[PDB]
Amino acid sequence: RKERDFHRMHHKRVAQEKNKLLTDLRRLKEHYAKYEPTILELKKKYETLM
Amino acid sequence: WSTQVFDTIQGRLQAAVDARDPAAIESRLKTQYDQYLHTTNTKVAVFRDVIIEQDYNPLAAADAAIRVPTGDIRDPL
Amino acid sequence: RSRLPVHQYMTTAVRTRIEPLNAAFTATMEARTRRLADATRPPSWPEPQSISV
Amino acid sequence: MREIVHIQGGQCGNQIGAKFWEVVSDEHGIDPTGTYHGDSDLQLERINVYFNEATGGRYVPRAILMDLEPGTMDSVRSGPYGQIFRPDNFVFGQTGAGNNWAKGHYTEGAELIDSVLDVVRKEAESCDCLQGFQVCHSLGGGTGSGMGTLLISKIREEYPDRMMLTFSVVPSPKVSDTVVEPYNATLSVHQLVENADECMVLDNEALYDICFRTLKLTTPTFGDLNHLISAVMSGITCCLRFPGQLNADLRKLAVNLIPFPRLHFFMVGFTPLTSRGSQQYRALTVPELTQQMWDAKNMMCAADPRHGRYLTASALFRGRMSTKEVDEQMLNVQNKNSSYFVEWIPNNVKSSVCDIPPKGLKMSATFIGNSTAIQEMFKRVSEQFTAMFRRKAFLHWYTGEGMDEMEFTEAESNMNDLVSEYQQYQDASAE
Amino acid sequence: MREVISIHIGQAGIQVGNACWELYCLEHGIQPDGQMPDDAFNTFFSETGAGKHVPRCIFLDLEPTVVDEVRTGTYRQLFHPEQLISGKEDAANNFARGHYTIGKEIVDLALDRIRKLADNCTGLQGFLVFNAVGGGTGSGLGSLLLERLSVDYGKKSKLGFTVYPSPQVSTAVVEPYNSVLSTHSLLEHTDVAVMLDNEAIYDICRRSLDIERPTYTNLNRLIAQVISSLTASLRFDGALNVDITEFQTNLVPYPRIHFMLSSYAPIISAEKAYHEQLSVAEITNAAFEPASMMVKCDPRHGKYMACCLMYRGDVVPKDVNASVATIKTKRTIQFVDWCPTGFKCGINYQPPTVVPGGDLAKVQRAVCMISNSTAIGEIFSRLDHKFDLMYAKRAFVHWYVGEGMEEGEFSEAREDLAALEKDFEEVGAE
Amino acid sequence: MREVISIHIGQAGIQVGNACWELYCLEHGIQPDGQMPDDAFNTFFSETGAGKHVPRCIFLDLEPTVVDEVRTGTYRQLFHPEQLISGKEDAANNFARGHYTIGKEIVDLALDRIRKLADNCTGLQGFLVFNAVGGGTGSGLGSLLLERLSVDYGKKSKLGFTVYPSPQVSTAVVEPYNSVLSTHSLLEHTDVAVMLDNEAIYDICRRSLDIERPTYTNLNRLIAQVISSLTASLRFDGALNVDITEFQTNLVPYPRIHFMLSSYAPIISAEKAYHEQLSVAEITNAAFEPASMMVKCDPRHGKYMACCLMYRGDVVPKDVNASVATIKTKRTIQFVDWCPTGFKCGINYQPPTVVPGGDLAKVQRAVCMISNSTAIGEIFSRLDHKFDLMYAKRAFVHWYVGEGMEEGEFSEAREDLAALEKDFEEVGAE
Ligand SMILES: Nc1nc2c(ncn2[C@@H]2O[C@H](COP(=O)(O)OP(=O)(O)OP(=O)(O)O)[C@@H](O)[C@H]2O)c(=O)[nH]1
Ligand SMILES: Nc1nc2c(ncn2[C@@H]2O[C@H](COP(=O)(O)OP(=O)(O)OP(=O)(O)O)[C@@H](O)[C@H]2O)c(=O)[nH]1
Ligand SMILES: Nc1nc2c(ncn2[C@@H]2O[C@H](COP(=O)(O)OP(=O)(O)O)[C@@H](O)[C@H]2O)c(=O)[nH]1
């Protein structure tokens, strides 16, 4: 039981850290999907200019 | 959670509420309420937590209630 | 017997007040109607079986 | 220059926040009209932490009031310090949430949350540097808990790095006010675990017990409990506002307190809480304040620390004291009560000192303890939630507000997992 | 902002409305002429160009006598002349007459005026329907109006303060008939139905008020005090504010189980006043006494599901908490296993105003305890055999058939009440 | 904090309680209306918010006349109207009537009011039950009430100040019968029973007060003074404070033996007052004189087991100890061999107040001696043959049988009283 509890908390804390990384990844992805349409619009203006 | 706890408890509630005949329920509640009516009409006053539990014992109604046992829970685990 | 469960019976007033409860009541009615069809269907007559030697 | 955005939610939260702003204005020498009348340079030195300077000499609190019914903030505005707040910060609906977390989080909070976040963003962008947000509210209520969790989630999405501090009034163990308190608390704890970085747990009955056993009051209205909570809320952040011999900001407290992120629930206490009768009979010494601080009755939380184990404990003192005295006293406390302290953490004490005590008191001390005792409180909330949820009593309203019945299972599972964390780190052995 | 529309149907409805509106006028300072010498009246009154306050109420009746009593009485200049709606022929204690043949045009006009009243309200907490279960006007017309309101208005919370037949004493013969019919009608249309029994109120007047000769005016005064205590949180601020919409959320464990006992405390005359402490704990115990209940039903028979307390006056959250803790620890009062809290306490800073000429005394504390309990199925068991005993012989069935009813309708109503009995047994069960 | 619940059952109980409450009101300054122009009254009164003080008392009787005399007299605004409980048919000196047929509803209501009274008391020192052993109301109803109190309240100290039939003089015929019944009933319920005899109190009034025409009012005034002296330690502070719970442990040697002789001193008229020194030693000797006993029982026949003395006024422990030492050295006063101390002395700084219109003089010192002695078995010996002389012919037995008695009940009462005699002889013997 002692060994089981030790491995339980190691596994759980690792899983929690993985979930935190996933949330951070979501945040950055949203933050830069905000920027991407500006690049697309500049591309359209560039093409029209040529 | 549904199947382990709620389905089990509702299934045990049924086949007990269903088993109880409506006529028996009516007769039981009638005996109780007529006992209360008789003690109200005879005695000058009616008090809770003061009854003599001899002429009128209302708690028998609570005794004659469906009891359902318990199994196991998955959410609490 | 086969009375509709207490927690699932939405009165007309509650159904009018809360649309999702009305939808849940309609869904439960549909489910109870569906439950009869499976019982009424004769579950016998399994598929023809080919054995081989 | 490290600002804090205050938010009040629900009736209980709004009352407590109004009391807190009254206390802060008293500390900074701000009259209810906003003009400074404190006669102290230190008071205006860091007034920007809580207030902004208006067109004149008036100072407007950086507070945002939320409600779904107008009566509570009408009373707040009619109160002694109702005119300091900016009117644009009063965001109200028209139909109050009938103690329905589903109504306050999904149906009626959805439309008002846009205005709430707009005002919050307006207040946050004005800040040069933002320490974070503090939300004062009560678990076990519809609009309070619902809008608090919704706004906390929104602010967490917007400002992930900024500090989030919560003062949640958990429903009391013994005498409960509303029927659906376990439901509301179970739904709110799930959100608070995930979103709020730092959370204080408070109980009306624990406050009553402390006000009858320490303060020995006769007829304590809700105002007295709000005053005690306001004192704790001031003392937690007095280091930001006043120079300290050993200062500690909110992030420092969080770093030194939180061993693992999900175990961020803390019980708080304020010292010295002395009865009117024994004011002369007690002597203000650091050992006295420490002895009162480590008493189980001094906790504003129902869970008694004795059953659990202290994971961590911070003590923010205020006043002219010897850091040697403070450190020796708290080390002595740890050595004496080592059984009640977690073994695999060599020092469970985060002691901080500020040089400015609250008015009237020569010195004071606020205590913030992260102990495994709150496990029993969450266990009790579960013992009520399961009792109602096994029969789905009172559940049809929440089902009808557009939240799935599986969400209750989610919330109970998450809270029980938190209980498991507290128990296992209570019984965890070194090596 | 917090408007509530009041409807009074039948003689009993109109006569309890007289007391209710007298009580509200006395509470808000509104003179009977219509005007008073902030905005606390908006829940019940809308102010007009002259400054006159008109109540948001509708007095509906198929009999002209009861309404003409109001048209001639002291409250002739207060109510709106078209708000007082009078029929031509009485329902004659016939549910069919009041629901099928006579009531149609009257209820159409009623919906017209109700729409006019609702268009005068920014918000609308809901409806307060005051009728008499046990009479054609009260049962049939009230049921029809509730049906129409549920159809059109939708989400408005309809609270029906129904007066049900007393167990042994009664004044009508077809009272079980139309009571069962109206119970079937409002089992699905009202949101919270409050039970009242004249025999229980008579016993309350006989013992607590020491009135050996109680009458309808006395009964209606107690009922009006109960309703005003219920609505006090809408009009006056206080600690733990309580709301019309949250009556449901804190009180109705399941939509079927929405019939509610009511009990007022203290019920004491002037001579017996200022003679006892009348503390919060004592008045709460009195409210949970079986005698204080306004329905002839022993609470000890069943188990309480929920109890909402409305305190008025100098009440502190400690006092209410300690009183409720003592009540919970008390062994006689039994609650269900599935509702560990089962309590909704709400205090108001406005003490109950006393109607001059009444018997109730000026008490600085008052409690209105409204309880959802499974014991109430017992009075339903009484009416369920009072019905079927006559229904076996089909006594007075031709009277109901003549105005467009069927034997199937009586059977369906009685079967629905039997289903309600089964429901009460199940919810009391674990 | 030191509340004591007073019960007055039967005509004699109510009539001595009239004097008791007059004495208490005069002692505390409480005007008869109810309110007075710290917290020493809490033992006997609970004060209301308006300032009116209501006694924690209950006047129980099956006859309307005695209670209506209180309802009409000067103390009509003091007592609680519902506390005054009146029956319809008198017990007719029938124990069975007062205990089995008429008394049931009355004792039910009595327990209800007793519960309400005790719920208003933080602490509860005990009960003071005043009845007259020898009448259907006092005996039967008092026994039933005591049994119910023992069942529900349990360990609370019940002090029964019973008035027993005099040896030769009497006013009833079946008085030995119902006296034996009541003695059997209360042998197992009351914790401390105090014996009083009308003949002895009449002799006291004749010799000491020089009243050649003593009456019930004077007897009740004497009893009231005795009880006030007994309770003075609860309300007024003084050296050697004595408690009701202390009474049982310092006075009752064995559970069966709990009957006590009572004697007050001095009993002197104003004319004879200030004509003797009335020192502590002299008043103690007077209290120990056989003539001063309020029971027709010569203490010289038996041996004292315990003597609790309550001193009121200017009494110093040196004087009380010198007086008690002289008493112990006196050969006439004989104590049992197994109780060498046998003395429970207590002093109080509040002198006994004088009732205007009474015969007692204002004496700065007073002694109330309550003694447990084996001589009291003599009165039991008298009633045991007064019972059996009638019982051999079964006189008046059919009357008791008519309300549900059997010969077995009378036999059991007689056997239990014989057992009490045997216990008295056993404890008296070495
Ligand atoms: N508590 C109370 N009940 C009343 C009062 N007035 C009438 N009732 C009850 O109301 C019932 C009948 O009311 P209604 O149906 O409105 O009588 P109505 O106005 O002639 O109309 P119909 O009888 O239906 O034709 C009776 O059984 C009474 O018990 C009252 O003032 N107070
Ligand atoms: N000390 C004292 N004893 C009294 C007084 N009045 C009556 N008694 C005694 O009380 C005895 C009977 O009392 P009760 O039983 O109460 O008389 P009651 O009220 O008519 O009731 P019943 O006789 O049983 O019907 C009589 O035998 C008297 O000796 C009194 O004023 N003082
Ligand atoms: N300390 C304190 N607690 C309160 C106050 N008012 C209400 N509460 C408690 O807060 C709990 C939750 O109520 P709340 O969430 O504000 O209700 P809501 O606004 O409708 O959501 C209730 O159970 C009350 O007991 C107050 O002024 N001070």
Contacts of D397 in chain E (CB under 8 A): 248-249
CB F324 within 8 A of CB F361: no
F12 lines ligand 2 (CB under 6 A): yes
Asked whether the beta carbons of residue E274 and residue F119 sit closer than 8 angstroms, the reply is no
Q: Answer whether D268's CB lies under 8 Å from D207's CB.
A: no
Q: Report the C-alpha gap between F143 and F133 in whole angstroms.
A: 10
Q: Which residues of D are annotated as a binding site?
A: 11, 69, 138, 142-144, 204, 226
User: How far from F147 is each of D241, D250, F191, CA to CA, in Å?
Assistant: 70, 67, 12
Instruction: Give the chain B residue whose CA is nearest to the CA of D415.
Output: B76
The dihedral through the CA atoms of E346, E350, E355, E361 has a sign that is: positive
For chain A, the first-to-last Cα distance in angstroms comes to 72
F300/C37 Cα distance (integer angstroms): 101
Asked if A27 lies within 8 A of D160 by C-beta distance, the reply is: yes
Tell me how far the alpha carbon of residue F44 lies from the centroid of ligand 2, in angstroms.
24
Q: Which of F166, F373, F212, F169 is nearest to F290 (CA)?
A: F373
F171 is in an annotated binding site: yes
Does the N-terminal peptide bond of residue E351 adopt cis geometry, omega within 30 degrees of 0?
no
Query: Which residues in chain A have Cβ-Cβ distances shorter than 8 Å to D421?
Result: 12
- Rounded Cα gap, residues D395 and C8, in angstroms: 10
Strands (E), D286-371: 310-318, 349-354, 364-371
Q: Are residues E16 and E220 in contact, defined by beta-carbon separation less than 8 angstroms?
A: yes
- CA–CA separation, A6 vs A12, rounded Å? 10
* 8 A C-beta contact, residue D269 and residue D365: no
Kindly list the residues from chain C whose CB atom is less than 8 angstroms away from the CB atom of residue B6. Answer: none
Name residue D268's beta-bridge partners.
Answer: D368
Q: Does C1 touch chain B (CB under 8 A)?
A: yes
Token code pair at residue D91: 């965001």
What is the stated resolution of the deposited model, in angstroms? 3.5
Specify the residue with its C-alpha closest to ligand 3, atom 22. D177
Residue in this structure with the two tokens 């407590």, named with its chain if needed: D16
Out of F47, F147, F199, F246, which one is annotated catalytic?
F246
> What tokens appear for E415 in the block?
């079967």
Q: How far apart are CA F253 and CA F305, in angstroms?
A: 8
Residue count of chain E, please give it. 430
Chains that touch B (3 or more CB pairs under 8 A): C, D, E, F
Residue written as tokens 């003074």? F225
Structural contact between residues D273 and D366, judged by C-beta atoms closer than 8 angstroms? no
Please, which residues bridge with residue D201 across strands? D168, D267
Closest approach of D113 to chain C, Cα-based (Å): 22
**Nearest residue by C-alpha to atom 10 in ligand 3:** D12
What amino acid occupies position C41? R
Residue with tokens 């409506």: B22
Q: Which of B1, B13, B70, B77 to mutate to probe the D interface, most D CBs <10 Å?
A: B1
Contacts of F296 (CB under 8 A, 6+ apart): F166, F167, F197, F199, F200, F203, F379
The whole-angstrom separation of Cα E180 and Cα E419 is 13
Strands E53-55 and E126-132: unpaired
Chains that touch D (3 or more CB pairs under 8 A): A, B, C, E
Provide the CB-side half-sphere exposure for D397 (13 A, CA): 27
Length of chain A: 50
Q: Backbone phi, then psi, for E61, in 5-degree steps?
A: -160, 145
Q: Is F430 exposed, middle or buried (0-12, 13-18, 19+ CB in 10 A)?
A: exposed
| F333 min Cα distance to partner chain E (Å) | 50
> Which residues does chain F have within 8 Å of residue E277's beta carbon, measured at their own beta carbons?
46, 48-49, 120
Kindly state if the Cβ of E215 falls inside 6 Å of ligand 1: no
Q: List the residue whose alpha carbon is closest to atom 16 of ligand 1.
A: E10
E246 an active-site residue? Answer: yes
- Name residues 15-74 of chain B within 8 A of C (Cβ): 18
CA distance D108 to E246: 14
Is any atom of ligand 1 closer than 6 Å to the C-beta of E91? yes
In angstroms, what separates the C-alpha of F330 from chain E's closest C-alpha?
53
Q: Cβ contact (<8 Å) for D179 and E255? A: no
* Dist. CA B55 → ligand 2 center (Å): 31
Q: In chain B, whose CA is at the least distance from the CA of C7?
A: B10
Which method was used?
cryo-EM
The three-class DSSP label of residue D141 is coil
CA distances from D84 to A11, D25, D118, F362, F377 (A): 51, 9, 20, 71, 85
Structure tokens at E50: 């002259």
Nearest-Cα distance to chain C for B18, in Å, is 6
Whether D150 contacts D365, CB under 8 Å: no
Rounded to an integer, what distance in angstroms lies between the CA atom of residue F52 and that of residue F35? 4
* Partner residue opposite C20 with nearest CB, options D391, D392, D399: D399
Q: Determine the residue of chain B that is closest to F88 in CA distance.
A: B44
CA–CA separation, B27 vs B47, rounded Å? 25
**Pocket mutation for ligand 1, best pick of E11, E68, E86, E203 (most atoms within 8 Å of C-beta):** E11
- The helix (H) or strand (E) run that includes residue D399 is helix D395-400
Q: Is F136 labelled as part of a ligand binding site?
A: yes
Which ligand 3 atom sits closest to the C-alpha of D169? Answer: 10
Measure the CA–CA gap between D81 and D272, rounded to whole angstroms: 26
Of E47, E246, E282, E421, which residue is the catalytic one?
Answer: E246
Contacts of C5 in chain B (CB under 8 A): 10
